[PDB]
Structure formats: structure tokens, C-alpha cells
Amino acid sequence: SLHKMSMMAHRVKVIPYSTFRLNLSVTSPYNADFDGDEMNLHVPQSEETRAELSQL
Amino acid sequence: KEKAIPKDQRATTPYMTKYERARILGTRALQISMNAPVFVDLEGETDPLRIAMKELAEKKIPLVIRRYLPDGSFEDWSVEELIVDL
Amino acid sequence: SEGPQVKIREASKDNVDFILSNVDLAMANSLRRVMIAEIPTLAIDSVEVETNTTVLADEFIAHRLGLIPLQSMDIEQLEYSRDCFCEDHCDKCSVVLTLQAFGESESTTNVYSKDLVIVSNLMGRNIGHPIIQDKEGNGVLICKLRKGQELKLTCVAKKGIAKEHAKWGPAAAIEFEYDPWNKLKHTDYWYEQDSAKEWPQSKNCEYEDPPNEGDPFDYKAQADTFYMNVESVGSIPVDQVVVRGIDTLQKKVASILLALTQMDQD
Amino acid sequence: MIVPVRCFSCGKVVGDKWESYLNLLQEDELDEGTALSRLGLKRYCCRRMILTHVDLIEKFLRYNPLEKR
Amino acid sequence: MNAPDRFELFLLGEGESKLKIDPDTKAPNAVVITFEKEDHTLGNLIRAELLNDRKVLFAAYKVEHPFFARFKLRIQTTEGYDPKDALKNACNSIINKLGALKTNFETEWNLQTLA
Amino acid sequence: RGNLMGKRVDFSARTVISGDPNLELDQVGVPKSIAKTLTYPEVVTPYNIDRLTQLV
Amino acid sequence: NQEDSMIMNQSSIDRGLFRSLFFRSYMDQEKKYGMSITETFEKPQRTNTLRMKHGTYDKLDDDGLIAPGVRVSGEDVIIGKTTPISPDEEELGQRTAYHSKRDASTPLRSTENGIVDQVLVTTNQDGLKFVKVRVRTTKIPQIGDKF
Amino acid sequence: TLKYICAECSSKLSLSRTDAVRCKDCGHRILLKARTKRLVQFEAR
Ligand SMILES: [Mg+2]
Ligand SMILES: [Zn+2]
Ligand SMILES: [Zn+2]
Ligand SMILES: [Zn+2]
Numbered sequence: 120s121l122h123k124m125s126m127m128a129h130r131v132k133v134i135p136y137s138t139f140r141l142n143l144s145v146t147s148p149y150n151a152d153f154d155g156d157e158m159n160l161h162v163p164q165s166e167e168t169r170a171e172l173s174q175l
Numbered sequence: 176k177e178k179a180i181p182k183d184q185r186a187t188t189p190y191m192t193k194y195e196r197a198r199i200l201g202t203r204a205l206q207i208s209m210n211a212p213v214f215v216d217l218e219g220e221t222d223p224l225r226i227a228m229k230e231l232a233e234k235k236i237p238l239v240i241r242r243y244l245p246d247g248s249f250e251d252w253s254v255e256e257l258i259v260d261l
Numbered sequence: 262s263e264g265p266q267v268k269i270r271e272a273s274k275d276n277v278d279f280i281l282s283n284v285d286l287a288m289a290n291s292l293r294r295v296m297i298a299e300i301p302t303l304a305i306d307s308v309e310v311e312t313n314t315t316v317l318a319d320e321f322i323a324h325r326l327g328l329i330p331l332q333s334m335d336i337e338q339l340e341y342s343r344d345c346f347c348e349d350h351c352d353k354c355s356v357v358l359t360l361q362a363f364g365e366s367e368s369t370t371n372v373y374s375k376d377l378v379i380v381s382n383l384m385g386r387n388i389g390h391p392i393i394q395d396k397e398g399n400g401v402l403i404c405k406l407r408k409g410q411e412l413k414l415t416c417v418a419k420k421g422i423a424k425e426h427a428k429w430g431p432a433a434a435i436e437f438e439y440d441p442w443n444k445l446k447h448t449d450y451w452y453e454q455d456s457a458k459e460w461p462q463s464k465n466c467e468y469e470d471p472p473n474e475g476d477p478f479d480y481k482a483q484a485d486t487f488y489m490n491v492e493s494v495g496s497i498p499v500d501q502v503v504v505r506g507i508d509t510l511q512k513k514v515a516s517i518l519l520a521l522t523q524m525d526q527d
Numbered sequence: 528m529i530v531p532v533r534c535f536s537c538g539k540v541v542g543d544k545w546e547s548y549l550n551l552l553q554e555d556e557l558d559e560g561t562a563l564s565r566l567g568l569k570r571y572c573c574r575r576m577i578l579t580h581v582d583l584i585e586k587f588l589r590y591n592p593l594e595k596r
Numbered sequence: 597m598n599a600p601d602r603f604e605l606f607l608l609g610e611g612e613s614k615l616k617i618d619p620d621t622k623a624p625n626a627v628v629i630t631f632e633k634e635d636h637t638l639g640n641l642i643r644a645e646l647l648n649d650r651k652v653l654f655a656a657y658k659v660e661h662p663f664f665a666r667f668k669l670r671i672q673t674t675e676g677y678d679p680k681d682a683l684k685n686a687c688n689s690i691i692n693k694l695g696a697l698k699t700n701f702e703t704e705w706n707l708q709t710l711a
Numbered sequence: 712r713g714n715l716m717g718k719r720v721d722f723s724a725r726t727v728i729s730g731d732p733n734l735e736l737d738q739v740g741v742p743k744s745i746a747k748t749l750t751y752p753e754v755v756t757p758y759n760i761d762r763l764t765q766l767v
Numbered sequence: 768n769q770e771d772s773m774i775m776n777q778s779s780i781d782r783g784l785f786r787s788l789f790f791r792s793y794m795d796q797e798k799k800y801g802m803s804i805t806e807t808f809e810k811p812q813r814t815n816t817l818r819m820k821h822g823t824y825d826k827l828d829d830d831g832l833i834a835p836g837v838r839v840s841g842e843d844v845i846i847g848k849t850t851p852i853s854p855d856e857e858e859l860g861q862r863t864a865y866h867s868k869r870d871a872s873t874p875l876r877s878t879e880n881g882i883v884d885q886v887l888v889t890t891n892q893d894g895l896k897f898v899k900v901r902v903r904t905t906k907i908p909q910i911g912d913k914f
Numbered sequence: 915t916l917k918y919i920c921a922e923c924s925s926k927l928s929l930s931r932t933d934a935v936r937c938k939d940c941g942h943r944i945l946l947k948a949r950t951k952r953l954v955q956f957e958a959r
Binding site: 142 | 728
Binding site: 781828829830832834835836837838882885886887888889890896 | 916918921931935943944945946947948949950952954959
């Protein structure tokens with residue numbers, strides 16, 4: 120996570136399987152591929168942080 | 176109160192910033208989610224964030240932003256009078 | 262009767278080769294898809310192991326057993342366990358087989374599919390018997406045992422479709438081709454010097470005339486005259502594979518129509 | 528460990544041809560390709576299924592049974 | 597483990613209907629039909645048969661996600677022609693064509709000797 | 712550096728990632744188990760009383 | 768299959784493509800703390816054992832071990848062991864004169880499950896009884912596995 | 915008492931809590947617990 124574009128806010132989509140799924144066009148900012156890479160997900164716990172996350 | 180700049184000589188930008196908009200929306204959404212009185216007619220809404228966005232669009236948020244300066248002084252800017260163009 | 266045409270080129274107990282003419286590409290593709298993934302078949306679904314001293318694992322043997330092909334000629338007379346009114350299973354929706362093998366000989370003893378014995382009431386049906394398709398009369402080499410090793414288990418077989426699990430698939434490879442001469446220009450042939458010399462001619466080229474070698478491209482032509490060859494694993498006759506594929510597709514379309522009428526009423 | 532029951536790619540039954548394949552190789556002195564063709568395996572997906580199989584169950588059977596009966 | 601049960605592909609769930617038809621406000625006389633527990637096998641066939649109707653202006657189908665076994669079919673017909681009736685006609689054509697094909701295959705097979 | 716500037720946090724998830732060409736730019740696919748584990752505290756309001764009761 | 772991903776045949780997976788067995792081993796010993804304290808393999812009861820895990824002890828035998836071939840799931844106890852406690856120690860109440868033992872069992876991994884394959888009991892160099900329990904599981908290819 | 919099997923001579927023994935862990939026939943110090951006699955269900959998938 121060397122730059123601010125490596126940590127961005129996404130909208131959840133509950134799907135069947137045991138892997139996160141992300142659009143291909145957003146791999147470059149994350150500098151990520153699908154050879155086994157792992158990514159972290161964080162859930163806000165308040166309306167203020169929720170709105171800040173979705174607006175910034 | 177020498178730190179309160181009178182409204183007649185405010186020199187800050189008259190446009191709401193992205194951070195100010197984000198905090199205003201979040202605070203109003205929190206207040207609405209905590210059963211706060213809504214001053215805008217709702218055509219059918221359940222998301223406090225969406226309700227707050229409607230309030231911001233119609234300039235019905237009773238909050239004032241206290242912009243601080245590096246010397247400790249501050250300027251009070253009403254959300255209604257702050258331009259939302261971003 | 263003046264609809265799709267069929268011309269059988271080679272018929273056998275394991276492969277059926279035919280030309281399906283005067284049909285649409287979507288219809289032919291749907292036919293092969295249904296024949297691959299939606300023909301009901303009987304296969305072992307649950308296994309209870311009473312004794313297992315083998316070098317192999319219980320799940321290993323269960324998977325091998327579930328992949329054994331079983332007769333499914335009269336499968337339509339069997340009921341789905343999900344749609345049957347029974348606690349776990351009964352004779353109306355399942356077939357029970359038993360396997361008992363012991364290493365009575367010093368040399369290695371092979372446990373095949375012919376050793377499975379049906380202990381359920383078939384009620385005069387024609388389902389359950391493992392398919393034997395080799396000269397020696399044995400079946401699939403389920404396992405091997407040495408002296409002193411025993412395999413005792415009971416299998417319960419239920420009907421299903423390959424969409425749920427590939428073990429219910431009654432059809433093997435399906436040759437599917439059309440326009441062997443590339444007269445519709447649906448493919449751009451990769452080549453280095455000469456595409457015609459670098460790409461071998463399909464065996465079906467003998468059933469269609471070659472291009473006129475100078476005629477304008479025919480933009481009004483549509484795909485037709487498909488060459489198909491169905492291979493069957495042996496659960497049901499190959500002709501039955503084709504017939505039941507058509508039946509299944511027809512039933513699915515009829516179900517769509519029935520649902521539409523049901524919604525029309527309301 | 529033991530010969531697969533079905534071909535992975537297409538699902539053809541190949542678990543009933545291991546003994547025949549070995550017999551063709553040993554007694555008939557036939558090449559692997561000729562034996563595979565004679566067994567009715569036309570697609571290379573099944574040809575590899577029977578050609579590249581390694582029989583480890585034979586080695587596993589060399590150990591004495593853990594439990595007698 | 598989060599792998600869905602395989603019977604979800606074809607078995608209809610509780611409170612779920614095979615067809616869900618909704619009007620399309622994008623264009624006049626247009627409807628969108630959601631087929632549940634169905635896939636390309638029916639989608640392509642129904643769409644191809646619909647395209648053969650002279651009174652059908654638009655017929656398309658799509659599968660939004662392969663994870664879920666359901667597909668959407670958009671049908672727009674000429675004024676005065678019901679898209680429901682267009683779908684009925686396409687389905688009836690499919691049924692008749694498949695029946696004719698089955699009869700032809702049976703009669704052809706009965707003429708063989710090796711099997 | 713080990714406990715104040717950065718620290719272990721709750722309401723987070725980690726797993727392998729995959730590419731989904733059928734997901735929007737800002738959408739992220741989340742496994743069902745991770746969704747069932749992570750929770751968000753929503754305040755009860757007249758606009759969501761029935762939905763929250765149904766969830767309970 | 769973009770960015771070093773792949774598409775696998777579900778039919779091939781069903782037929783046995785790249786399927787594997789996973790064996791996991793757990794070890795446990797009976798430690799003797801002095802001439803007074805000693806641990807023993809046991810099936811602790813809710814009336815005489817304190818701080819016992821919330822899992823299910825129904826699969827244990829009189830020796831505190833699960834016989835091979837039995838299925839186990841998350842939180843299931845596979846080796847049941849108990850140790851004595853000193854008096855004059857009350858924790859969250861719930862400590863009465865009936866309680867004289869405390870659980871020190873070894874539970875199965877939360878996310879793992881399978882069938883117990885082989886359990887062996889023997890003695891170490893010091894003569895204390897210790898046991899080894901092996902659990903089998905089947906790993907089938909998934910949408911996250913690496914090849 | 916519970917039934918065990920020697921790991922070398924494959925003899926079934928009946929051991930109690932007091933008996934030492936040892937094969938009374940050959941003397942081996944490793945015993946494998948006898949397989950449970952209750953049926954276990956397996957899916958053929
Ligand atoms: Mg990488
Ligand atoms: Zn029944
Ligand atoms: Zn094959
Ligand atoms: Zn011994």
C-alpha cells in the first residue's frame with residue numbers, strides 16, 4: 120500500500136465463493152494480480168465514517 | 176472574542192470543500208439515523224445518507240462550519256451560504 | 262414431418278453418427294448441450310462403509326463407486342428422492358447395491374463392478390445393473406486387495422442429471438461440425454504461407470461440394486447441415502441418448518409455456 | 528494410485544481397460560500407441576489417461592495390513 | 597467453504613417463480629422476461645426462434661453473471677402485437693420442430709442394422 | 712511503531728482475490744461467510760424498523 | 768482468466784482432476800507435575816470438569832480418544848484430557864465442591880473437518896502415555912486454489 | 915476396557931486404564947485403536 124490509490128472504497132456484493140472479486144480495470148492502482156495475491160477489507164462502524172468513505 | 180472574524184471581512188473561499196461536504200453529509204446522516212427532525216419533504220427514502228444529500232441539495236442543513244486558521248482565529252460559514260459546486 | 266432431417270451414416274452400440282439437416286444452429290447447439298448435461302441417469306449417490314482395511318481411503322472408494330456407470334433404461338419409472346415421500350430412501354426412488362470383497366488368496370485380488378449385488382426390489386424395472394463392456398466380463402477395476410484385507414460397503418443409487426454432478430452424464434464426446442469448407446467465412450484460418458495446404462481437410466468435406474473457386478461470397482447463406490456423432494458411456498443406448506435429449510428439450514420448452522399460461526391466469 | 532474410472536476431459540470409461548492394456552503390452556508385444564488404438568481410445572484425452580497413469584496401489588499393497596481379520 | 601449446492605442450478609427455490617415479466621420503459625411495446633434456473637440452452641434457442649418472427653423488432657438475451665443460473669430476455673414487437681404472444685409462438689414453433697425431428701430420427705434409426 | 716501508529720484492528724477480512732468482468736468498477740465481491748461474520752451496527756429508525764425486525 | 772487467472776472444467780473436477788487428500792496430525796501427552804499433580808486421558812463430564820470447551824464430547828470413548836473412521840467437524844474434541852486443580856480458587860463463580868478436575872483437551876481446528884484415520888497410543892522416552900491422532904480430508908479444486 | 919491392535923504383530927488386545935501400554939504377545943510399545951464398528955456415511959461425489 121505504497122500510495123493512496125492502493126486503499127479505496129468499494130460497494131459490497133455478496134457472491135457465492137471463497138474469494139474476493141474485483142473489476143479488472145482497478146488492478147493497476149492496487150498493483151495486484153490473481154496469482155495468489157491477498158487483499159484486506161475493512162468495514163466502517165458509524166454513519167459518519169460510512170459517508171466519509173463513500174464520499175472521499 | 177478577538178479570534179472571531181466578523182462576517183464583513185471573511186477572506187476564505189466561498190465554496191464548500193470536499194472534506195467539508197463529506198463531514199456535513201456524515202454528521203447529518205448520523206443525526207437523521209438517530210431520529211433527528213428532517214426539514215425536507217421525502218418522496219420515499221430510507222437511507223440517512225440519501226436524506227442528507229437531499230437536504231444539502233435544497234440547502235436545509237442547520238449546520239455552520241467553523242473554519243480554523245493557523246493563528247487560532249476562525250470564520251463561521253453557513254452551509255446554506257456555502258456554494259456546492261464540486 | 263417436413264422439418265429437420267436426419268441421415269444416419271454409422272450406427273453402433275457406443276457411437277451414433279448422423280447428419281442433422283434443415284435445422285438451426287441454436288437448435289443443434291441446444292440439442293448437444295441437453296444431451297451432455299440434462300439427460301436423467303442412475304448413479305451411486307451415497308455409500309455407507311462397514312469395513313475398510315484397504316490401502317485406499319473411504320472417500321476414494323466412494324468417488325470411484327459413484328463414477329461407475331449403471332443401467333438407466335427404465336430411469337423414467339424411478340422417482341427423485343427430493344420429490345419422494347420417504348424418510349431417507351425407498352424402492353420407489355433408489356436402488357441399493359452391496360459390495361463384499363475379501364483377500365482370500367495369497368495373490369492380489371481385484372474388486373470389479375461385477376461384484377456389486379442388487380439387494381433392492383427392482384419391481385421388474387431395468388435399472389441398477391452395472392454396465393459390462395469388456396471381453397473378459399469384468400467391469401471397472403474398483404480396487405485391489407491383498408491377503409487379509411476386506412472391503413464391505415452398501416451403495417444407494419439415485420437418479421439425477423449431469424448438471425448436479427458429472428457422474429450422472431450418460432454421453433461421452435460429441436463430434437459437432439458444420440460448413441467444413443468454410444463457405445460461410447465463420448473462421449479466419451491462421452496460416453504462414455498457404456492456409457489450404459497448412460490446414461488439413463475435415464473428413465466431412467466429402468459430403469459437401471468444394472467452393473467454386475471464383476464465385477462471390479454468399480452473404481445470404483445460413484448455417485445448416487450439421488454433422489454430429491454422439492458417444493455414450495453405456496448407461497443408456499445411444500439412440501436413447503438422442504431421443505431423450507430431444508424429449509428433455511421439448512419438456513423444458515413446454516414448462517416455459519405452462520409457466521406463461523399459469524401467469525396468464527393470474 | 529489406481530487407474531481412473533472415467534476420462535477427465537470427456538468422461539469415457541477407461542477403468543475397465545487397464546488390465547487389457549497391460550496384457551497387450553506384455554503378451555502381445557504391442558507398442559503403447561497400437562494397444563491404445565486397439566482398446567478403442569481414439570481421442571488423445573483418453574490416450575493420455577491410460578498412457579500416463581502410474582500404478583502406486585501395487586506398491587501400497589506390498590506393506591503388511593494394519594488390521595487382520 | 598462457500599460453494600453453493602449444485603441443485604440450485606436447476607431446482608427452483610421457495611418463493612421463486614420460473615418467469616418474471618416486467619414492462620420496459622426504454623421503448624414502447626417492450627418487455628423484459630427473467631428466466632430463473634435457466635441458461636444459454638433455452639436463452640439462445642428462444643431468442644433465435646423469436647428473431648425469425650416478422651413482427652418482432654428486437655429480441656436479445658443475456659446472462660448477467662455465470663454464478664447465478666438465470667437470464668434476461670428483452671422482446672420488442674410491432675404495434676398491436678403482444679410480446680407475450682410472440683414468446684408463445686416461438687415456444688410452439690420449438691415444440692413442433694423438435695417433435696418432427698424426433699419422429700425423423702426414430703424412423704431413420706429403425707432402418708439401421710448394426711444397432 | 713508496533714502498537715500505536717499501527718495495530719491489529721477488528722471488522723476486517725482477508726482472502727484471495729479474483730477478476731470478475733461482470734462487476735462494476737466500484738463493486739467488490741465479498742464471500743458469503745465473510746459477510747455473515749462482519750457486521751454493521753444500524754440504528755433503529757421509523758424508516759427501517761420493519762427491515763431490522765425481519766433481520767432479527 | 769485475466770491477470771494470471773485460469774478457467775477449470777467443473778466436469779473434470781467432478782471426475783477427479785487435481786483432487787487431493789490432506790492428512791493432519793495432533794499429538795498429546797500425559798504430563799506428571801511432581802508427585803502430586805498428574806494429567807490423565809478422560810472424557811470430562813459437565814458436573815466434575817471446569818472450563819471445558821463448548822464443543823461436543825459425544826464422540827469420545829472411555830479412554831478420551833475418538834476411534835478411527837468417525838467423522839469430526841469444527842470445534843469437535845479429538846483428545847480429551849483432564850488435570851486436577853488446587854482448592855481456594857473460584858473463577859466466575861460456577862466452582863462448587865463437585866468440581867475436582869479441569870479440562871485440558873485438544874480441540875480440532877475451527878475451519879477443518881474430516882474423518883479420523885488413525886489414532887495410536889504409546890509411551891515416550893520418559894514412560895508417559897502419549898497419543899497421536901490423524902485426520903483425513905479431501906481438497907477439491909476451487910475458485911481460489913493455485914496451480 | 916477397549917480394543918487395540920499391536921502395530922507390529924497385529925494382535926487384538928483388550929486394555930483397561932490400569933494396564934500398561936504394551937503388547938502382551940510380542941512386547942511392542944505401539945498400539946493402534948481398533949476401527950469403530952458404527953457405520954459412517956459417505957457421499958459419492
Ligand atoms: Mg502476484
Ligand atoms: Zn422414496
Ligand atoms: Zn477422453
Ligand atoms: Zn504385538
